[PDB]
C-alpha cells in the first residue's frame, strides 16, 4: 500500500493505490517473506509468487478497493490497514491548511496528531516511504505555491515512478479539495465512529449466526418430547418449540398439532418423523421442536 | 478416534471414544506429524504436544462429543470424521443381525455396504485398527453366543487396553440393542438425510450472513440520494431504501420523511447525516438508505 498526502492553504491532495496482499502460511515463513518483500530485493510480482511458492506459502493480491476517500468538499481521507492478530490501521485526513494522522488499534484510537500549516505525509511500508521521501525531498518545497491540479499531477508522477514494485497496484486514485472544514475534529470523530459501528455490527451478526446454528443443532431427531394434555401438546420441561429458525425465536410450551389422537397420549419423534408412541401414526405441526439445553449428549 | 461395533442375532453393540484432534499449521508439518501420530512411535499426549511444538504446529484435542448414537431401540450408529479440503466421514450402523458401513464424501454417499450375519467392524486410524484386531482375533469368536452385556464389557476391556494412546480419549460411550429393524435401509437413509439438511442449513445461513453484511456495507455515508417529488422522497435509480437490516429486506423507491422542506428540493447525506442540499437543515426517516449496487468505488 502507498498513500501520499499534501496539505496547505492552497488545498489538500491525497493519492493512494489499491493493492492489498494477504498471506496464508506459517509464522516464520510469513515473517521471512514479509521482510524480504520490504527489503527491496524483491523486484516484481514474478519473484514474489515464485519465492512465496518456494516457501510453501500462498499470497493473494487484491487491487479491487480504494484506499482513499473524499468525505466532502472540505475533507479527504486515506487509510492503510494491517490485519493479523490485531487489526491495526493508519489513516490520514486532510483539508485546507490542516492534516490529521490517526492511529487505530482494533476499536480504539491510540494516537491522533493534527497539524496546521504546510506539509506532506506518506503511509506505507519501510521501502516505499524510503523511496517516496527521496522523490519528494527535492520537489516538495514547490508544492505550497502550486495550484491543486499541478500537485495532483506531481503526485501522479511519484506513483508512476514507484508502481513497478509489487507492494503497489498499477492503478491508483487521487482526490483533492480547496475548502476549509470548520469542525475538522468532529468530522474525523464521526467518520471513525462509523468504523466502530461496522465492527460492532460485524460482531453482532457473527454472534447471531452461531446463535441460529446452535438452534439448528438443537432440533430433535429422536426424542420423547411430550404428552397431549386437553387436546394440546404439552411439552416436557426438557424440550421447547419455536416458530422460525431465528436467532431469538419465540418459545412455546403448548403447541397446536393436527392428526388422529386423544388426551393422555405420549408424543415422540424418530428419524425426524413425529408420531404417537404405540400408534405409529403420522402427526404434523407448524412449529419446530428443539432441546431446551444446548448440551444433549455433551458439548 | 476409535469405534468398535459388533452385530449378530444376539444383538448389536457399539463402543466409541470422544476424541477429536484438530491441527493448525503448514501442509508438510501437518502430514509429518499426521504420520508420526499413527506410526505408533508417539507414546502419549506429552510427546504429542512436545513434538507438535517442535514442528511449530498447534494441535487442539477435544473429547467433549460422542461418536456413537442410539437412534432407536432397534438401531445404533457410530461416526468417524476427517475434515480438511473435503469433509470425509465413515459411519457404521448396526441392529439385530444386520450391519451397515457407510462412506460419505461431503454431501454424497460414496459407498454403502450392508451385511447379514455375525461380525465386527472397527473404525479408526491404521495404528488402532492394527492393535484392535490383535485383541479381537482371539476373543471375537466367543461373541456370537454371549449375552449383550458381556459383549459390552468385552468391548469396554478393549477400550481400557487401548485408551493410553493419544488418538483415544480416556472416556468412552457404549450403546446396545437386541431388536430387529424391519426397514433398516430406510432408517439409515433418513438419518443421513438429516446430515445433508444440516450442511444445507449451514450453507444457507453462511450465505445469509454475508448477504446481511453486504447490505450494511452498502449503507450510504455520503451520497446525493434523491429529490422530494410531491411531498415524498423519490430516490434515484442508483439508490434504494430498506425497512430493516435483513438478508432479504423490502425495497422502496418512495419513502416517508419528516422535516422542513418543499417539492423540488435535493436530498443529500454527508457523514451519515441526512440534510437538504443548500439548507443544511436536519431531515429524518424511518428507513435505511443504501446503494443499489454492491460496487460503489470498486469491489
Amino acid at each position: 500500500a502507498l498513500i501520499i498526502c499534501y496539505y496547505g492553504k492552497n488545498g489538500a491532495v491525497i493519492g493512494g493505490d489499491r493493492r492489498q496482499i494477504f498471506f496464508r502460511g506459517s509464522e516464520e515463513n510469513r515473517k521471512i517473506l514479509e521482510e524480504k518483500l520490504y527489503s527491496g530485493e524483491i523486484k516484481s510480482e514474478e519473484e514474489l509468487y515464485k519465492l512465496a511458492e518456494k516457501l510453501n506459502i500462498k499470497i493473494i493480491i487484491e487491487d479491487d478497493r480504494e484506499k482513499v476517500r473524499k468525505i466532502s468538499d472540505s475533507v479527504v481521507c486515506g487509510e492503510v490497514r494491517s490485519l493479523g492478530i490485531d487489526a491495526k490501521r493508519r489513516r490520514v485526513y486532510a483539508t485546507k491548511g490542516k492534516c490529521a494522522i490517526v492511529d487505530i488499534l482494533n476499536d480504539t484510537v491510540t494516537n491522533q496528531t493534527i497539524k496546521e500549516g504546510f506539509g506532506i505525509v506518506v503511509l506505507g511500508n519501510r521501502f516505499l516511504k524510503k523511496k517516496a521521501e527521496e522523490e519528494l525531498k527535492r520537489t516538495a518545497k514547490l508544492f505550497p505555491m502550486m495550484p491543486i491540479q499541478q500537485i495532483e499531477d506531481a503526485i501522479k508522477e511519484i506513483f508512476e515512478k514507484l508502481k513497478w514494485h509489487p507492494t503497489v497496484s498499477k492503478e491508483y486514485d487521487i482526490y483533492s479539495v480547496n475548502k476549509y472544514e470548520k469542525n475538522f475534529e468532529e468530522v474525523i470523530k464521526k467518520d471513525i465512529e462509523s468504523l466502530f459501528k461496522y465492527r460492532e455490527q460485524l460482531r453482532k451478526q457473527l454472534i447471531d449466526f452461531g446463535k441460529v446454528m446452535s438452534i439448528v443443532n438443537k432440533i430433535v431427531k429422536n426424542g420423547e418430547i411430550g404428552v397431549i394434555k386437553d387436546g394440546k401438546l404439552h411439552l416436557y420441561d426438557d424440550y421447547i418449540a419455536i416458530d422460525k429458525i431465528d436467532p431469538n425465536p419465540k418459545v412455546f410450551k403448548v403447541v397446536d398439532v393436527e392428526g388422529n389422537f386423544k388426551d393422555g397420549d405420549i408424543v415422540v419423534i424418530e428419524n425426524g418423523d413425529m408420531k404417537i408412541k404405540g400408534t405409529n401414526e403420522k402427526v404434523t405441526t407448524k412449529y419446530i421442536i428443539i432441546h431446551k439445553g444446548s448440551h444433549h449428549h455433551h458439548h | 478416534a476409535l469405534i468398535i461395533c459388533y452385530y449378530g442375532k444376539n444383538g448389536a453393540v457399539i463402543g466409541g471414544d470422544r476424541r477429536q484432534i484438530f491441527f493448525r499449521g503448514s501442509e508438510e508439518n501437518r502430514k509429518i506429524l499426521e504420520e508420526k501420530l499413527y506410526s505408533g512411535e508417539i507414546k502419549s499426549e506429552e510427546e504429542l504436544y512436545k513434538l507438535a511444538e517442535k514442528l511449530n504446529i498447534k494441535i487442539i484435542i477435544e473429547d467433549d462429543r460422542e461418536k456413537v448414537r442410539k437412534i432407536s431401540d432397534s438401531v445404533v450408529c457410530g461416526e468417524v470424521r476427517s475434515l480438511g479440503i473435503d469433509a470425509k466421514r465413515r459411519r457404521v450402523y448396526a441392529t439385530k443381525g444386520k450391519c451397515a458401513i457407510v462412506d460419505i464424501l461431503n454431501d454424497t454417499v460414496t459407498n454403502q455396504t450392508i451385511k447379514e450375519g455375525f461380525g465386527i467392524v472397527v473404525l479408526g486410524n491404521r495404528f488402532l485398527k492394527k492393535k484392535a484386531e490383535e485383541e479381537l482375533k482371539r476373543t471375537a469368536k466367543l461373541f456370537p453366543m454371549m449375552p449383550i452385556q458381556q459383549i459390552e464389557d468385552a468391548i469396554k476391556e478393549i477400550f481400557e487396553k487401548l485408551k493410553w494412546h493419544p488418538t483415544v480419549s480416556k472416556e468412552y460411550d457404549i450403546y446396545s440393542v437386541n431388536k430387529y429393524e424391519k426397514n433398516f435401509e430406510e432408517v439409515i437413509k433418513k438419518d443421513i438425510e438429516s446430515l445433508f439438511k444440516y450442511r444445507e442449513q449451514l450453507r444457507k445461513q453462511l450465505i445469509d450472513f454475508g448477504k446481511v453484511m453486504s447490505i450494511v456495507n452498502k449503507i450510504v455515508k455520503n451520497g446525493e440520494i434523491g429529490v422530494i417529488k410531491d411531498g415524498k422522497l423519490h430516490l434515484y435509480d442508483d439508490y434504494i431504501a430498506i425497512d430493516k437490516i435483513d438478508p432479504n429486506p423490502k425495497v422502496f423507491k418512495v419513502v416517508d420523511v419528516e422535516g422542513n422542506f418543499k417539492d423540488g428540493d435535493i436530498v443529500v447525506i454527508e457523514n451519515g447525516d441526512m440534510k437538504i442540499k443548500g439548507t443544511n437543515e436536519k431531515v429524518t426517516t424511518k428507513y435505511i438508505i443504501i446503494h443499489k449496487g454492491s460496487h460503489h468505488h470498486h469491489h
Binding site: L83, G84, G119, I120, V121, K129 | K58
Partner: peptide
Amino acid sequence: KITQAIKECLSKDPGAIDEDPFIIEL
C-alpha cells in the same frame, strides 16, 4: 476456535505499519 483460527491464519500486509509514517513540515 474458528474466529480464533482465521486471525491466526490470514495476515493482510503485516509489518506494513511497523514503522512511523514519513512526514515533512514545509
